[PDB]
RNA sequence: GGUACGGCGGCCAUAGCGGCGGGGCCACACCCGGUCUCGUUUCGACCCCGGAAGUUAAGCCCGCCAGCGUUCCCGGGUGUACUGCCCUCCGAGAGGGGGCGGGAAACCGGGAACGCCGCCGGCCA
RNA sequence: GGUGCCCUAAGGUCGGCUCAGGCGGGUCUCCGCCGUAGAGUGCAAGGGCAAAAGCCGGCCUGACUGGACCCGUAACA
RNA sequence: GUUACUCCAAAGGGUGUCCCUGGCCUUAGACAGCGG
């Protein structure tokens, strides 16, 4: 029996949280700042359901290209296609 | 604790000093904050801004340096901080009160009144403000019959004529 | 019932969850300890497997009955402690035919999975019934789908099988 | 063992017990589906309203349905409680049984339907003591727990109750 | 320069639970009362308002403790279990082996560990 | 293993408060205590959630209008 | 047996022979024969 893809499919470990985080993250993440050309990691915080992209791209690295609202625009490479996301900065993490 | 899977809350929550949800809603505003705190015998009023390593305090105030814990002193503290911070050069702010609940008729909102009258721009409403017959002191000058507005007024004159 | 070569091997995932297996059978063997349970015997005698096995509860109960009868008539209850170490959790499957349309076995039985150099049984005994202990072990070894070997452990958990065999 | 509250007073009263409060209730419950008039009784008795207390999970005997008031409870502090106690202790028989006390310094009269100090009541009367600075385990700001070197036990409570009115068994 | 003071914070158990010894001008607390600002499906117990008659007993502050929990290091367990590539290696087969590279978890013995770092004050001189 | 629905609140926000279970009292809903959530969430499973996303209340109807861009179904394509 | 793999039998047994290891014996040992 086949099964389409959907947001929360096979997310039992990827979107599970360690039993010792369990609540809000520290507030040094909602207020992260980023510049253009800055490379970022896509790492999802399961407690915040706003600005969360498809978990398909959990663990990938992209580049910032702009800003819309309180969200940042991110480009990733998927094979040879470019894909653009609007992500809240609690789901992101700077390189180095 | 009692083993793994036990979650040991943040320290300032554990102690009972800080609400992190409210903190987040306030930080999302990138304006400076006006922290007003109350105790049994004193009233504190600071100006704070955010740094990732720890909130930096620009201007402060204390009822002791004033005298050199009620609504009149709250108002005068507000006046003091409003003249100090506009001199520092920050003509905007927003109120933080912490874990004190909002009740109309409180020395915290009298601090707000003072900081406004001293000329600092702070969004608010003109309905929580206590009434001036509690401001000046007529409440205690009425309890007297079952501190004087003389002193309140000439002290107000001191503060203004010195921070002109 | 059907031969044991069909269920000997281990090359197959585990199937141990009764809160998902519909119609899972129930155990036949319900006694795993015998003799003097409170005890301080001298010599310990255990079977180890020579390779991974998958042993049915039919076989376990056969072993139990035989060995216990033998030792009850040749040793006596206050002088031996007999234990079976392994419980049957693995559910066995059989295809009910339709042919090979919708093949997925309905459950028939249970088995214990055992890895290489694992213990299966144990007889604790004094020094003047070792002959009987080893006869029991022969009888048991004879009823298993693959081979097995025995040792003789001391308290302090040390191997003394050679020093004991050479002198008896 | 009176040396206990002897030491209470010795150190200074900061470690002295007292009555935090009193409460009174219809315990065995007699309204079922009604809102009775012992409602009115208790008010006549003391002089401040009684507090209804609605049902719970559908029961078998006492309150076999939810949401229906069945009982009543009230709370006294300050001097009302001291005073109301002064009649009630005289009303019960003397040499009170520690076997109804609490292992932490409290108690709750078993006795039902006795009238003293000037028809149907079935009733249960509970007391609560505490040293003074208990405020901090209630107040929001900097709330935390209370150690054992400041809590109570059976013995201190017994000797404190013995201090006025009834002696004990 | 001094403090057995304080407010706002960051890392969020190496900080937690429990246990003990000591301290109180200035400050935080517990306290007395509450008409009014506020309210308790009923009580100034909670919260809000004004003072301090009393004390440090509790919370706070200084110091220590390895009973439980967490984290890091030293030896063992052990180069064990499992593993990527190659093989005209073994074996009836199931499955194992050799060479080149990576490499645990339990458990044992011994250490440390009963929080670290920012900004601003207040008062004594 | 479940859906082919239900809800003017079970929808928006503001404030206050904490759960199941047990121990110890009182009789056949009352006081105190321990309690990392072992409860509850409109409905399955998984995930999330404690000064709360749970319970108690007060005020409302963003379950609106005109329009852009991007992710999935349908990886790469 | 003369089979890399394609295409090839087990559990259970053996003073058949060639080897490793560890106990007990030994200047009278382990069999025999002569008698108690």
Swiss-Prot record, chain A:
Listed GO MF terms: structural constituent of ribosome
A biological-process GO annotation: translation
Keyword hit for Electron transport: no
GO cellular component, one term: cytosolic large ribosomal subunit
Record keywords: Ribonucleoprotein, Ribosomal protein
InterPro entries per UniProt: Ribosomal_eL21, Ribosomal_eL21_arc, Ribosomal_eL21_CS, Ribosomal_eL21_sf, Translation_prot_SH3-like_sf
UniProt xrefs under Gene3D superfamilies: Ribosomal protein L21
Disordered: region residues: 1-26
Regions of compositional bias (Basic residues) in chain numbering: 1-23
Subunit composition and interactions: Part of the 50S ribosomal subunit.
NCBIfam families per UniProt: PRK04306.1 (NF003303)
Family under the similarity heading: Belongs to the eukaryotic ribosomal protein eL21 family.
Protein name, UniProt field: Large ribosomal subunit protein eL21
Source organism per UniProt: Thermococcus kodakarensis (strain ATCC BAA-918 / JCM 12380 / KOD1) (Pyrococcus kodakaraensis (strain KOD1))
Designated gene of the protein: rpl21e
Swiss-Prot record, chain B:
Keywords recorded for this protein, A-Z: Ribonucleoprotein, Ribosomal protein, RNA-binding, rRNA-binding
GO CC terms of this entry: cytosolic large ribosomal subunit
Signal peptide boundaries: none
Family matches, as Gene3D superfamilies: 3.30.420.100
Gene Ontology biological-process entries: ribosomal large subunit assembly; translation
GO molecular function: 5S rRNA binding; structural constituent of ribosome
Alphabetical list of InterPro entries matching this protein: Rbsml_uL18_euk (IPR005485)
Role of this protein: This is one of the proteins that bind and probably mediate the attachment of the 5S RNA into the large ribosomal subunit, where it forms part of the central protuberance.
Family named by the database record: Belongs to the universal ribosomal protein uL18 family.
Subunit structure and binding partners: Part of the 50S ribosomal subunit. Contacts the 5S and 23S rRNAs.
HAMAP family xref list: Ribosomal_uL18_A
Protein name per Swiss-Prot or TrEMBL: Large ribosomal subunit protein uL18
Source organism per UniProt: Thermococcus kodakarensis (strain ATCC BAA-918 / JCM 12380 / KOD1)
Gene: rpl18
Curated annotation (Swiss-Prot), chain C:
Classification via CDD domains: Ribosomal_L16_L10e
UniProt keyword terms in alphabetical order: Ribonucleoprotein, Ribosomal protein
Molecular function terms from GO: structural constituent of ribosome
Manganese keyword on record: no
Biological processes per GO annotation: translation
Cellular component GO terms held in the UniProt record: cytosolic large ribosomal subunit
InterPro entries, sorted: Ribosomal_uL16, Ribosomal_uL16_arc, Ribosomal_uL16_CS_euk_arc, Ribosomal_uL16_dom, Ribosomal_uL16_euk_arch, Ribosomal_uL16_sf
Xref: Pfam families: Ribosomal_L16 (PF00252)
Subunit and interaction comment: Part of the 50S ribosomal subunit.
NCBIfam families: PRK04199.1-2, PRK04199.1-4
Stated family: Belongs to the universal ribosomal protein uL16 family.
PANTHER family, per database record: 60S RIBOSOMAL PROTEIN L10 (PTHR11726)
The protein's name: Large ribosomal subunit protein uL16
Organism name: Thermococcus kodakarensis (strain ATCC BAA-918 / JCM 12380 / KOD1) (Pyrococcus kodakaraensis (strain KOD1))
Gene, per the UniProt record: rpl10e
Swiss-Prot record, chain D:
One CC-aspect GO term: cytosolic large ribosomal subunit
Keywords, in A-Z order: Ribonucleoprotein, Ribosomal protein, RNA-binding, rRNA-binding, tRNA-binding
Role description: This is one of the proteins that bind and probably mediate the attachment of the 5S RNA into the large ribosomal subunit, where it forms part of the central protuberance. In the 70S ribosome it contacts protein S13 of the 30S subunit (bridge B1b), connecting the 2 subunits; this bridge is implicated in subunit movement. May contact the P site tRNA; the 5S rRNA and some of its associated proteins might help stabilize positioning of ribosome-bound tRNAs.
Protein name: Large ribosomal subunit protein uL5
Keyword RNA-binding: yes
BP GO terms, sorted: translation
Record's keyword annotation contains Nucleotide-binding: no
One Pfam family matching this protein: Ribosomal_L5_C
Organism annotation: Thermococcus kodakarensis (strain ATCC BAA-918 / JCM 12380 / KOD1)
